[PDB]
Design a protein around this ligand. Structure first.
Ligand SMILES: Nc1ncnc2c1ncn2[C@@H]1O[C@H](COP(=O)(O)O)[C@@H](O)[C@H]1O
Ligand SMILES: Nc1ncnc2c1ncn2[C@@H]1O[C@H](COP(=O)(O)O)[C@@H](O)[C@H]1O
Ligand SMILES: Nc1ncnc2c1ncn2[C@@H]1O[C@H](COP(=O)(O)O)[C@@H](O)[C@H]1O
Ligand SMILES: Nc1ncnc2c1ncn2[C@@H]1O[C@H](COP(=O)(O)O)[C@@H](O)[C@H]1O
Ligand SMILES: O=P(O)(O)OC[C@H]1O[C@](O)(CO)[C@@H](O)[C@@H]1O
Ligand SMILES: O=P(O)(O)OC[C@H]1O[C@](O)(CO)[C@@H](O)[C@@H]1O
Ligand SMILES: O=P(O)(O)OC[C@H]1O[C@](O)(CO)[C@@H](O)[C@@H]1O
Ligand SMILES: O=P(O)(O)OC[C@H]1O[C@](O)(CO)[C@@H](O)[C@@H]1O
Ligand SMILES: [Mg+2]
Ligand SMILES: [Mg+2]
Ligand SMILES: [Mg+2]
Ligand SMILES: [Mg+2]
Lengths: 327, 327, 327, 327
């Protein structure tokens, strides 16, 4: 029996005896991702280069891919009538949905992650995290400031050689491959679990002169193994969604610790770190800042940053031990 | 006026006063690339998972993406009636085309480059190099053993966030974006030239323990600039086609030198090194093994490996200086 | 607010306080239609003509469009776990779903209507009707033998210049246009109502010598108006879904009465007549055999045929009056 | 070997020893057809309905399908650098191409034929006729006023259940099916020939009251065969391109004679009648006005109308006999 993402969310909704609001929300997300994907692959770009001349746009209507993605998510999610608060990396303040379309969910998301790889056509994606409004007060930013451990659903969509949507909820992580021919996400990996120990480390070594002693010692250990084993291979795409996804599928470790330019790390806690940390833990992986669990951080700024180390259990604990040793 | 790959090729053929054979060859290459791109993006995957019943071959009995790609290239190229000899990474010996479909061209290619990035959906692609048959004796593998300097055309197709074909010939490097909506490649950047110097280095530091003194010193400079300037950023996708394209567009340097386990490097000369070296020089860049120009090497085996250092002229020259610095 | 078919069925399910089974069923239908559509437009036909040579099919695997459509519906519907009895024009006996996937719904359908227009690429489509099992007995064909008036949902998908899915339920008829770019049906026509009187008649006049006096008199009246007005224009595609859809959108009348070859008419009652009759009546139209309401016929054969006249109110009643006059 | 429209055209160009100009023209025509096909199938319609926000132009402010199609043809054709004069159904006067893009060919076309079938999603298409500029004086409308007999190439693209392009030149009629999956037209039937006699007649019997005695008698024979053979079946889609294609493939006859409101017929000579007449004769069929060959008419206005009767030789000849029968 083939299983589409649409059949899956609906069924999981039924098993949970939900009123259907979250389902309608997940369905919206699915539609948003397909639209972003189609745009990312440059469908209709011939129109930009005047295949039909220059007459359509009566004015100056053009939009950067990232901006368009942001508009797709915002509109699509709002039209689901399931959300009350939206947090986008593209907006300085949280977006409070009008009462007429207000729902109980809070959605934090990165509409198009990996901006530095956009112009060079490297894999990019969309990241998201979903919370339930924990309050009775007027909806506001505070409703977005919950620790990751409270997430009800999280995941991402990877626009690589092929497009894949990975969804994590309380009962596990599932990966669905997008069949562009019929516009359908097909479940191809069910209760996904990450390998206990990998053979690949992922980090931008250009910041080498700014790394702490723990990170420095660990990287050295990956190149010159004390047990004289084969050193880990290195891989760093530059796009979090791509590096993180390979980590889930192949195992290993991904890191983005603090440095001069980023004493609190670079990546955003609400719509980058937490979602990926939740996916990792649901797959039996770990996600730490080096000192604490990412999902346990109670945020105070919707755009707050956080250091992050995630991936295979044994790999992450090995680094955690280096941190504990130096302490 | 909008320019499609098809119009471009046809015009370069009329200017060159070609008989139309090379044009048919490039036309076919273009068609193959599109077919590969569609399979890579997973159109029709739902059928593989029983969308229409007949769920039995669910395992490992249907063509793998790399095999399908190889089939497309070989079949499409033969059907152009423009080739006599074909060299594929997936085939131990050179393919000698039937006398009935025999043409004057020789093609070396990598049907799907970046095999390790396939399962994690990281960017992958196709690389090609075209030679004009010179000798008069029956076609053989010796016909594909010419130095890259004799290349008539070379390039690649990148299956990334979007698909792009990069073609380099005597008078330039042109990039064409594929519009999947109409199955048309659109010219989006004409006579491409790489920047004199970049701020990104690309190499698998995993073989640090195996690197020669020159590479080791160069990397040291990128992380700890002696003049105290800003350190280069690091990027290593793992697919040559993806790392090389970013190099062409953003500038910088890409490296795969020889390591213990790979005394003569890892990358293949005929269908990986030469094509990329040809694209780089035509763009004003450099491609060296650290001691000689890649394009000058006289191949002795169609699967011969060779070390390669390519990218921005100033960055490549700096490493060359280090190589000669170490005598 | 844009509305996808997926959001619509889900919401209509919520408003009805259904357990979600019918929704999962409607969602399945939606997926089936997209797959059939993609096939009808000939996606991947290049593989049939050996663009990748001849190596994939280890044997002789080819399928006629109609057969494939049938397999898509059967499998897709069964995988919804919402049906117990399926009736296809392609199967002599009703299909009783296994207990493991058994649901409460009975589905009658024409997987690919308009077979005579297939080879000439004329518009074709899929027709469907849905009933709820009215019994406690073991599921069987009888469960499919309910009069049209009992339908819970009916409609069709038209594969014409563009693909459109028209869905009718108790509270009205809605048309959704398929956006192939993102694989999404977009609601573009809400509580659709047919014009009270049209200006187009649709019938195969090749059977002229076999028509009854009523039909003959009516056709004459359409060409030579007694009130001396402009005669109706004639239109007959040859595909019921196409002729019927134009009738809904433009108004007018569609007819397929009995003749020598078909004393009980040609069209099938369960998966051709009833579904279209239900759509017509929900749009304020009429559907008669000339003597009685199509939806009131209690069938005794799943493959039973019925004469049918449908379309605008005034047009159909005018013919009904001719029938009553001759009586 | 699989043959694409692109390979076919390029080869016919090499055989004909053409300079490559007509080839570029056909290459462009092919690209235009694909772009039209994608718009007709409604890709990206979700954007028109606010999928990404900006819901204000929802009404009648964006280009209609017929206008967009016309823009594509004109722009794409000009950009081929192969034409000097263009005649479109949508333009009152002939388009004289700028001297900078001027070529030796003249093109008459119907951007989107079957306007009345657009809103009901019935099959529609594009028709074209290509002439070689002969005179030496400045290009003008007179250059498009040559009898169809001088046509160098003519044909059409049918946007039906699937999209197909039919091209007719001096040595034959070939049909190519469009594979939307890769944006490639595949040759599926080479030197096409219509059957000597069909069993289907196509005409709008709505103008029965206006038909001349010949047509009236012929139709009588099709419904009430004097020799008591089987009556012909009737089919009338309403889009010339759709009715003519079925005629080519299934055989039979298509008719649009002159009626009171249309003393000189309805269909246009330059871009409807001549192209279809050219395709029919090259396929062994006939195309008459009832008194003369369509292709022999010397046009006096680029929007001149003309009666037309085309199809299987025996069926057309029988009607011609009736015409001369009535003196
Ligand atoms: N589609 C679903 N998948 C998983 N859990 C769900 C789903 N729908 C509802 N739930 C769970 O049920 C709760 C209430 O759902 P709702 O009434 O739709 O807001 C959600 O917050 C989830 O914990
Ligand atoms: N489409 C083309 N683009 C660029 N150069 C071409 C093209 N066609 C032919 N040439 C040049 O002309 C030579 C002979 O072409 P041909 O007669 O097709 O084998 C080629 O080796 C190229 O150097
Ligand atoms: N998506 C829906 N749209 C319209 N009516 C629905 C829907 N879902 C359920 N219903 C109605 O509620 C009944 C029970 O639904 P269920 O419990 O899903 O079998 C159906 O037979 C319909 O009458
Ligand atoms: N691709 C082609 N297919 C068929 N005939 C062609 C083609 N190219 C050129 N011809 C013939 O050669 C003539 C001159 O071609 P050209 O030099 O391109 O204007 C045309 O008018 C055609 O009769
Ligand atoms: O260039 P740097 O410092 O490695 O930053 C790359 C990181 O920044 C981001 O682009 C920010 O979202 C991530 O996708 C990626 O992990
Ligand atoms: O794992 P490694 O040794 O870095 O290999 C990476 C290289 O291997 C390849 O996949 C070989 O084709 C290249 O695409 C890539 O540059
Ligand atoms: O050739 P005939 O007798 O008009 O039959 C055409 C009818 O048959 C069908 O193909 C049967 O489904 C209908 O779609 C169409 O209305
Ligand atoms: O409604 P009528 O008079 O039959 O017109 C039908 C004809 O009109 C057209 O739409 C005119 O382009 C043709 O495609 C078709 O043959
Ligand atoms: Mg980001
Ligand atoms: Mg390779
Ligand atoms: Mg039928
Ligand atoms: Mg027309």
């Amino acid at each position: 029996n083939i299983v589409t993402l649409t059949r899956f969310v609906m069924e999981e909704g039924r098993k949970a005896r939900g009123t259907g609001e979250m389902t309608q929300l997940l369905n919206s997300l699915c539609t948003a991702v397909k639209a972003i994907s189609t745009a990312v692959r440059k469908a209709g770009i011939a129109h930009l280069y005047g295949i039909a001349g220059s007459t359509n746009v009566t004015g100056d209507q053009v939009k950067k891919l990232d901006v368009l993605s942001n508009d797709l998510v915002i509109n699509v999610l709002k039209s689901s009538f399931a959300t009350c608060v939206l947090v986008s990396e593209e907006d300085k303040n949280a977006i409070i949905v009008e009462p007429e379309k207000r729902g109980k969910y809070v959605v934090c998301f990165d509409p198009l992650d990996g901006s530095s790889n956009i112009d060079c056509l490297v894999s990019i994606g969309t990241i998201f995290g979903i919370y339930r409004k924990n309050s009775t007060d007027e909806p506001s930013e505070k409703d977005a400031l919950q620790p990751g451990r409270n997430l009800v659903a999280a995941g991402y969509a990877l626009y690589g050689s092929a497009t894949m949507l990975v969804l994590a909820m309380v009962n596990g992580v599932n990966c669905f491959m997008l069949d562009p021919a019929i516009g359908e996400f097909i479940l191809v990996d069910r209760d996904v679990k990450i390998k206990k120990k990998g053979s690949i480390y992922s980090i931008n070594e250009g910041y080498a002169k700014e790394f702490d002693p723990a990170i420095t010692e660990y990287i050295q250990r990956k190149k010159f193994p004390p047990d004289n084993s084969a050193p880990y291979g290195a891989r760093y795409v530059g796009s979090m969604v791509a590096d993180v996804h390979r980590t889930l599928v192949y195992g290993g470790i991904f890191m983005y610790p603090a440095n001069k330019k980023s004493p609190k790390g670079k990546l955003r806690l609400l719509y980058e770190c937490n979602p990926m940390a939740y996916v990792m833990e649901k797959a039996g992986g770990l996600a730490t800042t080096g000192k604490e669990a990412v999902l346990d951080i109670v945020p105070t700024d919707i755009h707050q940053r956080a250091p992050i180390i995630l991936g295979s259990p044994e790999d992450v604990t090995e680094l955690l031990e280096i941190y504990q040793k130096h302490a």
